[PDB]
Amino acid sequence: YFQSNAMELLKHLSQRQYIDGEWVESANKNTRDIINPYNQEVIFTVSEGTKEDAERAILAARRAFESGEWSQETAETRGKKVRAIADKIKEHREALARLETLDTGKTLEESYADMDDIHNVFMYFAGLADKDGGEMIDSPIPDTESKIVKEPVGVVTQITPWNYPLLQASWKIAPALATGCSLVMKPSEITPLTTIRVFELMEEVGFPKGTINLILGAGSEVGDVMSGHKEVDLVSFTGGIETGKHIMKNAANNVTNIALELGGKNPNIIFDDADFELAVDQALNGGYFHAGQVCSAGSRILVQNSIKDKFEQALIDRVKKIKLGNGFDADTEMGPVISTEHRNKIESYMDVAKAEGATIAVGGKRPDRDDLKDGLFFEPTVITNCDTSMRIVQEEVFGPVVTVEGFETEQEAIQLANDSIYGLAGAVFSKDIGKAQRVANKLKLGTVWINDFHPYFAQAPWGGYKQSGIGRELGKEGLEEYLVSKHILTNTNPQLVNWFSK
């Protein structure tokens, strides 16, 4: 009784926003219904905040920041509180995993793995909090002392996507809290459940009023307030490229720093000297984990011409066996897509593939099976006889869809892999490790996997080249987005200059 228990969890979950230490409704009492993508049933109703609520949260975050209660707390103590959040995630791993599956549709196994990652993100940043306060500089001016002090950047606004909501939240919350910033977070309007829950958990730990704030929904001009308010010091946005560009333009009005992660067209490069069985397995894993909606998805398969036919038929044969179903059922290998609008977007992209002349080798429709009929399912799809000039190869579909292109040589694989506007992540499969390393050094991607697909972890920075984003999350670089440098120069033997006549 996995799903019905998860449903009973909801009877204890807050429905409200969290602003300045209090759970509160929307200023105009508006609500929004949240859906289970497996059966499209409404599972919960939450507040839908207004732009005045967002304004209020940002002003509270500012007041808290200036008060120093969190920003001037010792780094060691901030780290202890971030660890306490980590430990709460582990304590509540089952419930959180179940809530994530209910809200997003992914398999329970995927959700459990995700909860383990999230615990490790918090634990990583807890440990990093007190490890680097700045630098002493060897001043070139005699009788001076020069130091660089790291300070928290201030008030941060954090906007997360519907694909891996709590995971993306953790990437933003952990460094903000570790550094002493105040934050205002707004999860996707579609998938707020686990974010609400993590806010309840953070309240249990206890932070100064205003240090953490949660805004819910997609209210009119809320996004604009979060990117454009004069009191914001950093906007951290993960989501679609068009929204990201708008956010950056908004941020310019007050000279606000931005960190953006905007998607990808991630290549999966398979040489003829790859372990063949491995490359087929990982092409499946690349394409279809979380129904191709995880940000690391490998939608663009590039395979060496010599084995392309062999590869295509192996991949297609496997794709026909993929088990679709309820994320709570153990035999499910792939769940539904996230929303009606997203499935429609995916369907309109298949309109494009057809208008461009590509072949849908398998999939490309909604499944008919009775038990899948009420849910937001779409068949795992393989598109063949496509080329780099096509919209279906160039544009991010964010669904259970891969394209397959051939290449003759190493140089052509690199040129094709780099021929998109994006640059987030990708893989190279070859037993020739030297070759794989040559390719990796030429790919304009923030993360390159050699003989693997998907890995990310707190210890290493993640983010895009090209139009995939600005900045990095995770690792030390991720922490650094939340800090500002101040050079304090002291003249220890000050003398008159006497430039101007006396």
Tell me the C-alpha distance between 454 and 425, whole Å: 9
Nearer residue to a second copy within complex by CB, 52 or 87: 87
**Binding status of residue 255 toward Mg ion by CB under 5 A:** yes
**Binding status of residue 236 toward Mg ion by CB under 5 A:** no
User: From a second copy, Mg ion, Cl ion, none, which one binds at residue 498 (CB under 5 to 8 Å depending on kind)?
Assistant: a second copy
**362 phi/psi in degrees, rounded to 5:** -160, 150
8 carries an active-site annotation = no
Catalytic position from the list 100, 189, 261, 410 = 261
Nearer residue to Cl ion within complex by CB, 254 or 409: 409
Question: C-beta of 457: minimal distance to a second copy in Å?
Answer: 5
How far, in Å, are 60, 197, 221, 227 from residue 27 at the CA level? 16, 21, 14, 20
Q: Say whether 237 sits in a helix, a strand or coil.
A: strand
Question: C-beta of 376: minimal distance to Cl ion in Å?
Answer: 41
Q: What angle do CA 224, 471, 156 make, to 5 degrees?
A: 40
Tell me the C-alpha distance between 41 and 34, whole Å: 8
Q: Does residue 479 contact residue 272 with C-beta atoms inside 8 Å? A: no
User: From a second copy, Cl ion, Mg ion, none, which one binds at residue 410 (CB under 5 to 8 Å depending on kind)?
Assistant: Cl ion
295 carries an active-site annotation = yes
User: From a second copy, Cl ion, Mg ion, none, which one binds at residue 281 (CB under 5 to 8 Å depending on kind)?
Assistant: a second copy
**Nearest Cα to 448, choosing from 468, 424, 467?**
424
**Nearest Cα to 347, choosing from 364, 334, 369, 360?**
364
Number of residues interacting with Cl ion: please give it, by CB under 5 A: 1
Tell me the C-alpha distance between 273 and 431, whole Å: 6
Nearer residue to Cl ion within complex by CB, 312 or 410: 410
Q: Does residue 216 contact residue 17 with C-beta atoms inside 8 Å? A: yes
Tell me the C-alpha distance between 303 and 413, whole Å: 8
User: From a second copy, Cl ion, Mg ion, none, which one binds at residue 293 (CB under 5 to 8 Å depending on kind)?
Assistant: none
**Binding status of residue 410 toward Cl ion by CB under 5 A:** yes
Question: C-beta of 366: minimal distance to Cl ion in Å?
Answer: 39
User: From Mg ion, Cl ion, a second copy, none, which one binds at residue 82 (CB under 5 to 8 Å depending on kind)?
Assistant: none
Q: Say whether 94 sits in a helix, a strand or coil.
A: helix
**Binding status of residue 256 toward Mg ion by CB under 5 A:** yes
Question: C-beta of 450: minimal distance to a second copy in Å?
Answer: 4
Catalytic position from the list 48, 55, 295, 480 = 295
Q: Which residues are catalytic?
A: 261, 295
Contact positions vs Cl ion (CB under 5 A): 410
